[PDB]
Design a protein around this ligand. Structure first.
Ligand SMILES: Nc1ncnc2c1ncn2[C@@H]1O[C@H](COP(=O)(O)OP(=O)(O)O)[C@@H](O)[C@H]1O
Ligand SMILES: Nc1ncnc2c1ncn2[C@@H]1O[C@H](COP(=O)(O)OP(=O)(O)O)[C@@H](O)[C@H]1O
Ligand SMILES: Nc1ncnc2c1ncn2[C@@H]1O[C@H](COP(=O)(O)OP(=O)(O)O)[C@@H](O)[C@H]1O
Ligand SMILES: [Mg+2]
Ligand SMILES: [Mg+2]
Ligand SMILES: [Mg+2]
Lengths: 530, 526, 524
């Protein structure tokens, strides 16, 4: 009697390295613990006072950021429930672009309180019922918590004041400059139609100087050089070809079949005369800049130099397509001169040197166009990548504002009002669902709690102050990070606002993730390959 | 689980796992031991790691010799070991009833019934079954015929039929010989000696004693007719002084005097023995046999041989009492004041050599309250089998004598107790009626296995028997030769009331505790 | 800190969190700074690093040293990155940037240990950086005269300063004049590819030279190249991208004939193709021929018989420089070789330069290009000479584009430390300590100068702190006198953008490192 044998049945039939967990203890509580550990790994990055993390992935690449979704991507999360919470966070990032850390915090809080309720004696079914009804109540409430709206997305001061909040959590010290830049870019590329494309905001990260030297450019920048002798052009007449800048050849094997000394003597001269004719037709269409997606031939380059044409080679096809969108051109698959409509135009096309880097700039002078670029300067590649992530946050906020112009107060004001109102709803709702409703309400407190903890003040005092002010009636009041002591102020009057859609989707996705984690009851992991 | 977070190298069986493990091991033990039950059971051969052979049908022997490393099996082996230590019989039935209780309880626990409720029903059924047992026990004057039937009922299950017909008379006569009216039977006073030369049916009862040694002096007689037996515990060899002494002499003559003197102390005890011998046997008509629990050096052996005494040395601390109860003398630790009243009488004493060993028979005692069973057989494993069988039979007869009551066998009491429990079930409150039903169907495993081993249909035979017991009310059981019902009390198939009571008690308790086990855990590792 | 059946992260993930992690980051940055400290200033020393292949690099350049160090610490990689960024944006100050960043971190280390909030620290850093940058832009001396002699004096002085830290400091006037002539002869774009730097082992630093033209090494001549002449006194130059040799007229070309007359016609046709190319090149008047593509033995001998010069496989950069110097265009076809596309120089020569043969194009008056020819006794000698000249050239370019000069030797750092101490004594008291720490950190440049020189940095910094508070802004370390001096009068001049970008990059690195509160290494 010195060994416990595996029980007859599934325990014996299980494969070698496979694992089986069942019940509240082995499965539910362990999943809640994993999600709690995840939320703890990402909690200290929440808010403007949130600190950055330097994650090194298996490829020895370094990420310095406080972007929750980025941190999650670069972590090797291996617990399946945590993987599910990460899937929710990434879906939030895809749908909205901001709120991933909210999703993480809120899901972890919901799961901790669900564990508490299961310990006090509720069943997973009742917890899920209460969580769902409380999420529905929160979605019913939030539209009433909407305080202001954009009212104009073609302005640059209003748009900057609107993006400042989203770009404050990241890059807290310097956010007015960045909001100016991103507002300039977004309103430049905002068309008369209400549709806004996030891919039309390009970001060029160039080494050297610093973020205060960053700028917006109505056009495109390519870390390329020119193929020929011409480097500048003041009235660009760009012609774009998806084909190489060479003589067209057959897709079937072509052979030069010579049978006479005359043909042999004349072949090369005829080839050169043909190339000269092609490029001269292109130049005579007025084009002074040619952009080819393929390679360039030596003779064609010779004759482009002869006829004073700036040659540019864009290896990428996305780069070619975006240049076409920028300049108003059409990529021709043949080396035929372009018609008046297939040609593109730019107020200038020139070769410059930003720092050590050589760049080709297609610059419009008008304050509009289909594509705009943000040239990010910075002393570190990691710093510039973090600023690019902040730019992505601002641009996705702009798109969310194009979708839904409604705004809710930030700094925990909406969270506190939601907690209060859902608590008041649960106090009226009878039955065992009230416990879960009240815990769903208390979960919102995790947001101002995380903000306070990172601000450096007592979260309990902050939350008590917030509850008192929201009880006396101020729904736009949230915490003040610019205060060494626990303090609070009007989020609306301060201009700290979030997006109705952001909050809506964050709440929905966090609740769905928590509810799925709870709905799991048995886990049958396979032997980890490797 | 919880324990594996603290001790990673921990093995754990929780709730259902634990119950499945325990019931599976119990059913495995039951499946092995099912064939031991009854005279139609099968003999198992057991080969040690050294190559030693054991032929057994005994449940306890089979348990301890099987090669098992299971915790439930250890628990049940210990329960059977206690059953055997206290009663001598009932180990196979014990294991079977435990396994069947566990199985019949799993039948209802798999359907969501709680093991606590099943165990409550088990407790109720145990109470009612003990009552019915006290009611059905047959209080009988323990005559030689009754004791013969009992010992037959045990020995015919444990050994071959002819050897059982011999061992029955052997065991009954031994018990009827070492037994004093209203005085607990000391089975230690029945020696059990095995000799390995003749057939197994030569096993006999010597109305005396058989020592596993003989005289160590060749000139000592090998046969003595009318013998005075002196049972002593006095060293007759050279003893050195407790305090370190040593001899100091200045001459070879002084050395010789000291050599002659250093033995005077033991020479005096030899002289005392020899003088008693001369005083009680003035001639060579009678004989004189010294049996010493301690040693006797060659000088003392020679001195006693010269006077015609047969001296055995290094006898057994139990043989002291066995000799004083068979012969009738007094065992001595000193020859301070020894008298002819200290001697016993044996109407014959002789020696028997078997290869390199010698045996000494002490027979024709007057009224020996101690005897020996001489286990003769051609093989060591035959002798071991007969030793186990006579242990079983002696325990059986002793228990039948102690408890003047005796219970019918052949599953008769089990059938009747099942019927009584099933008629009592409605008086039980709640879903413990299912525990009662499980107890009854578990008790019914004895007739079932008896039929299975005689080669009959369990269900058909059991339905016939239960029908006969309900129609007639007679305590009826299995006839292992026809498969028909038979009255065990009329055909002489008897079991021990003590054995049945111990079965009920210990089986119920261990089955309850196993059913209430909800976590098996090995976490002692450092 | 307890085992779990299934762990959140992959087994082997090492997470360092909190004040200890931050202090360790600061310590790693201190190590990285120590690795370059001793290179700072005129008394600075060189470092020898060796790779796994066993090839050694000897350098005074901080960016180079830090690139060569196989730094893997995630926080200490940031100093290497900002040194790279400084070398990119400016080209000088690479050691100063790392020293300043590490010193900021060291100075704030105590408050970090005592639990001062990193957000507060970075806010103070940003404030002090903006202040110091605006103060540099305010007090930088910018002569508003646009005089050519004074702008050449300015460029020469800035170059002499940028070179007074290298192994060519004993020839810094020489090399500074050469660097200044080079960047003043470049075109508006000031392209670095338009300055050639050849390294010819053998010779002295003073034997090095600048060619107002172009020069490149002889390229695998065939037979007859020695029958060619090697000096021309007013040549016209044909620059080509043309392979001149008997070759398959095309790779997918297959001739098919069924007559020996046609066979011979085809042979003669190949020969006539080649000879016609050669005859066009010969009739263009070009006496020198350069091709980006091979020039075969037949063409070599043709040109030798016509008393012309030919060189094939010329590198693309040398061809582009020859073009920018002589004033022609590179031709893939020889069918239109007009005087507009031909080049011209006053002298072409092939000379011996220290075991190698070099072609010299000299006398080009319209030359927007120049080629440095550097001599020295070792590959790494010439490499460190080239790196020094690159520093000087980048300095001169930035100065040409913005002639706004400050003084060096730590003068500007002491002035900014004074200004920031003054400013900090006027603020509540939490930011006061941090901005005072910034100020004390700024003093690491003169301190390290005195250290590397072998002085008493304490006494010299006392003298400087005193003299900067009495009135006087360009007082810094005087190295040859073991004292202080007005470095603006001593002509230790430094473009303002150097220190502006140094402060910007160092403060950004410090803010980043201090904003990081956790490090998570995944298993590889
Ligand atoms: N100046 C500020 N004062 C107080 N709270 C702020 C301020 N700026 C932003 N916040 C809060 O920070 C939160 C955003 O944190 P962030 O790291 O962006 O999380 P996520 O990216 O998941 O939205 C918002 O809920 C907002 O209320
Ligand atoms: N001749 C017989 N006919 C029918 N049943 C018998 C006979 N002999 C013994 N039995 C039954 O077999 C059962 C088990 O016998 P045995 O194996 O000797 O004891 P245990 O199983 O306790 O070791 C007894 O309860 C007895 O009633
Ligand atoms: N002749 C000089 N006298 C005093 N200080 C000098 C002199 N030349 C340079 N310095 C100082 O040396 C410092 C660093 O020199 P250097 O090592 O060339 O910089 P880096 O290595 O950062 O490019 C500069 O801040 C400058 O003020
Ligand atoms: Mg955000
Ligand atoms: Mg028996
Ligand atoms: Mg320098």
């Amino acid at each position: 009697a010195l060994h416990v044998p595996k029980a007859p049945g599934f325990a014996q039939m299980l494969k070698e390295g496979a694992k089986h967990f069942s019940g509240l203890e082995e499965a539910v509580y362990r999943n809640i613990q994993a999600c709690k550990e995840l939320a703890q790994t990402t909690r200290t990055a929440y808010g403007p006072n949130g600190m950055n993390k330097m994650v090194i992935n298996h490829l020895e690449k370094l990420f310095v950021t406080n972007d929750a979704a980025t941190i999650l991507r670069e972590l090797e999360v291996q617990h399946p429930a945590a993987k599910m919470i990460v899937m929710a966070s990434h879906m939030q990032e895809q749908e909205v672009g901001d709120g991933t850390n909210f999703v993480l915090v809120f899901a972890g809080a919901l799961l901790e309180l669900a564990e508490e309720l299961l310990r006090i004696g509720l069943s997973v079914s009742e917890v899920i019922e209460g969580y769902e009804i409380a999420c529905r109540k929160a979605h019913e409430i939030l539209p009433n918590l909407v305080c202001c709206s954009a009212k104009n997305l073609r302005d640059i001061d209003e748009v900057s004041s609107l993006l400042r909040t989203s770009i404050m959590s990241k890059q807290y010290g310097n956010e007015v400059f960045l909001a100016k830049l991103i507002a300039q870019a977004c309103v430049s590329i905002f068309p008369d139609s209400g549709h806004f494309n996030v891919d039309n905001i390009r970001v060029c990260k160039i080494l050297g100087s610093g973020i205060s030297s960053s700028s917006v450019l109505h056009g495109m920048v390519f870390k390329k050089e020119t193929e020929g002798d011409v480097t500048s052009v003041k009235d660009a007449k760009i012609a774009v070809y998806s084909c190489p800048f060479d003589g067209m050849i057959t897709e079937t094997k072509g052979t030069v079949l010579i049978k006479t000394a005359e043909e042999l003597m004349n072949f090369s001269k005829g080839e050169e005369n043909l190339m000269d004719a092609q490029v001269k037709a292109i130049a005579d269409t007025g084009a002074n800049v040619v952009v080819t997606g393929g390679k360039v031939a030596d003779m064609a380059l010779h004759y482009a130099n002869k006829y004073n044409i700036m040659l540019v080679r864009l290896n990428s096809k996305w780069d070619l397509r975006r240049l076409c969108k920028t300049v108003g051109a059409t990529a021709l698959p043949r080396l035929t001169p372009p018609v008046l409509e297939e040609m593109g135009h730019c107020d200038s096309v020139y070769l410059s040197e930003v720092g050590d880097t050589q760049v080709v700039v297609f610059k419009h002078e008008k304050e509009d166009g289909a594509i705009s670029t943000i040239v990010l300067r910075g002393s570190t590649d990691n710093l510039m990548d973090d600023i690019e992530r902040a730019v992505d946050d601002g641009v996705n906020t702009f798109k969310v504002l194009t979708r839904d112009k409604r705004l809710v107060p930030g700094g925990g004001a909406t969270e506190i009002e939601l907690a209060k109102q859902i608590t008041s709803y649960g106090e009226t709702c009878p039955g065992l669902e009230q416990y879960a409703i009240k815990k769903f309400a208390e979960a919102f407190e995790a947001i101002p709690r995380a903000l306070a903890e990172n601000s450096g003040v007592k979260a309990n005092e902050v939350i008590s102050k917030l509850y008192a002010v929201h009880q006396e009636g101020n729904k736009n009041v949230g915490l003040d990070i610019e205060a060494e002591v626990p303090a609070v102020k009007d989020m609306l009057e301060a201009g700290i606002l979030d997006t109705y859609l952001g909050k809506y989707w964050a709440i929905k996705l966090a609740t769905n993730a928590a509810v799925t984690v709870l709905r799991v009851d048995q886990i049958i992991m396979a032997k980890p390959a490797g | 689980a919880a324990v594996k977070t603290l001790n990673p190298k921990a093995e754990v069986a929780r709730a259902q796992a634990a119950l499945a493990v325990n019931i599976s091991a119990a059913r495995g033990l039951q499946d092995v031991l099912r064939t031991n039950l009854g005279p139609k059971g099968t003999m198992k051969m057991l080969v040690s790691g050294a190559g030693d052979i054991k032929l057994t049908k005994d449940g306890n022997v089979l348990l301890h010799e099987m090669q098992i490393q299971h915790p439930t099996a250890s628990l049940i082996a210990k329960v059977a070991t206690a059953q055997d230590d206290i009663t001598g019989d009932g180990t196979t039935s014990n294991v079977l009833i435990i396994g069947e209780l566990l199985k019949q309880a799993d039948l209802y626990i798999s359907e969501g019934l709680h093991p606590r409720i099943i165990t409550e029903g088990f407790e109720a059924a145990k109470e009612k079954a003990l009552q019915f047992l006290e009611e059905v026990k047959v209080s009988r004057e323990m005559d030689r015929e009754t004791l013969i039937d009992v010992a037959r009922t045990s020995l015919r299950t444990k050994v071959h039929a002819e050897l059982a017909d011999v061992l029955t008379e052997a065991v009954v006569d031994s018990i009827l010989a070492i037994k004093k009216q209203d005085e607990p039977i000391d089975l230690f006073m029945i020696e059990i000696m095995e000799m390995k030369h003749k057939s197994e049916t030569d096993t006999s009862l010597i109305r005396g004693l058989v020592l596993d040694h003989g005289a160590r002096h060749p000139d000592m007689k090998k046969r003595v007719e009318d013998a005075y037996i002196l049972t002593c515990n006095v060293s007759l060899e050279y003893e050195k002084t407790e305090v370190n002494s040593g001899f100091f002499y200045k001459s070879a003559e002084e050395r010789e005097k000291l050599v002659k003197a250093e033995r005077k102390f033991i020479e005096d005890r030899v002289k005392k023995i020899i003088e008693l011998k001369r005083k009680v046997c003035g001639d060579s008509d009678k004989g004189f046999v010294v049996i010493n629990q301690k040693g006797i050096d060659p000088f003392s052996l020679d001195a006693l041989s010269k006077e015609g005494i047969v001296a055995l040395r290094r006898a057994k601390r139990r043989n002291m009492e066995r000799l004083t109860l068979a012969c009738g003398g007094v065992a001595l630790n000193s020859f301070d004041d020894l008298s002819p009243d200290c001697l016993g009488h044996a109407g014959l004493v002789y020696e028997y050599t078997l290869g390199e060993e010698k045996f000494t028979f002490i027979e024709k005692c007057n009224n020996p309250r101690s005897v020996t069973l001489l286990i003769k057989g051609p093989n060591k494993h035959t002798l071991t089998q007969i030793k186990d069988a006579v242990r079983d039979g002696l325990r059986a007869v002793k228990n039948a004598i102690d408890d003047g009551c005796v219970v019918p066998g052949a599953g008769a009491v089990e059938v009747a107790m099942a019927e009584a429990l099933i008629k009592h079930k409605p008086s039980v409150k709640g879903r413990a009626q299912l525990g009662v039903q499980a107890f009854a169907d578990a008790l019914l495993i004895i007739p079932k296995v008896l039929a299975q081993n005689s080669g009959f249909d369990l269900q058909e035979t059991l339905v016939k028997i239960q029908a006969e017991h309900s129609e007639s009310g007679q305590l009826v059981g299995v006839d292992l030769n026809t498969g028909e019902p038979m009255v065990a009390a009329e055909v002489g198939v008897w079991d021990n009331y003590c054995v049945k009571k111990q079965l009920l008690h210990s089986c119920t308790v261990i089955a309850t505790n196993i059913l209430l086990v909800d976590e098996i855990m090995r976490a002692g590792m450092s | 800190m307890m085992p779990t059946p299934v762990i959140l992260l992959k087994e082997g993930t090492d997470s360092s969190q909190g004040i200890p992690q931050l202090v360790s980051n600061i310590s790693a940055c201190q190590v990285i700074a120590e690795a370059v400290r001793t290179t700072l200033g005129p008394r600075g020393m060189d470092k020898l690093i060796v790779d796994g292949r066993g090839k050694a690099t000897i350098s005074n350049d901080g960016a180079t040293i830090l690139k060569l160090l196989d730094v893997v610490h995630p926080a200490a990689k940031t100093l290497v990155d900002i040194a790279k960024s400084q070398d990119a944006e400016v080209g000088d100050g690479t050691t100063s940037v790392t020293l300043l960043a590490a010193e900021f971190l060291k100075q704030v280390k105590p408050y970090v240990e005592e639990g001062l909030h990193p957000q507060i620290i970075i806010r103070a850093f940003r404030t002090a950086t903006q202040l110091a940058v605006n103060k540099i832009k305010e007090i930088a001396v910018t002569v508003k005269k646009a005089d050519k002699v004074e702008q050449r004096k300015l460029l020469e002085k800035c170059a002499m300063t940028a070179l007074s830290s290298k192994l060519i400091s004993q020839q810094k006037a020489f090399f500074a004049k050469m660097v200044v002539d080079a960047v003043m002869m470049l075109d508006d774009l000031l392209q670095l590819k338009m300055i050639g730097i050849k390294k010819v082992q053998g010779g002295a630093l003073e034997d090095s030279q600048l060619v107002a033209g172009v020069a490149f090494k002889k390229t695998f001549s065939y037979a007859g190249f020695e029958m060619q002449p090697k000096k021309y006194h007013n040549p016209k130059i044909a620059l080509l991208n043309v392979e001149l040799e008997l070759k398959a007229e095309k790779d997918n070309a297959e001739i098919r004939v069924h007559t020996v007359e046609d066979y011979q016609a085809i042979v003669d046709a190949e020969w006539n193709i080649l000879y016609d190319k050669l005859e066009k090149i010969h009739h263009s008047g070009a006496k020198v021929v350069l091709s980006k593509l091979p020039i075969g033995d037949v063409a070599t001998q043709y040109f030798a018989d016509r008393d012309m010069f030919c060189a094939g496989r010329v590198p693309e950069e040398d061809l582009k420089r020859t073009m920018m110097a002589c004033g022609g265009s590179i031709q893939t076809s020889v069918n239109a070789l007009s005087a507009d596309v031909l080049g011209r120089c006053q002298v072409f020569e092939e000379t011996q330069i220290g075991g190698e043969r070099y072609n010299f194009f000299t006398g080009c008056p319209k030359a927007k290009t120049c080629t440095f020819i550097l001599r020295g006794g070792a590959e790494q000698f010439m490499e460190e000479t080239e790196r020094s000249l690159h520093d000087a050239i980048m300095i001169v370019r930035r100065a040409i584009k913005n002639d706004s000069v400050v003084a060096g030797g730590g003068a500007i750092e002491m002035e900014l430390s004074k200004y920031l101490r003054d400013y900090s004594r006027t603020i509540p008291g939490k930011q006061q300590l941090l901005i005072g720490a910034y100020a004390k950190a700024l003093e690491i440049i003169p301190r390290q100068l005195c250290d590397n020189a072998g002085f008493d940095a304490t006494n010299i910094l006392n003298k400087l702190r005193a003299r900067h508070a009495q009135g006087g802004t360009w007082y810094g370390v005087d190295i040859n006198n073991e004292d202080i001096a007005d470095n603006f009068e001593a002509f230790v001049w430094e473009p303002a953008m150097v220190r502006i970008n140094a402060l910007t990059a160092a403060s950004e690195a410090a803010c980043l490192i201090v904003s990081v509160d956790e490090t998570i290494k995944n298993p590889r």
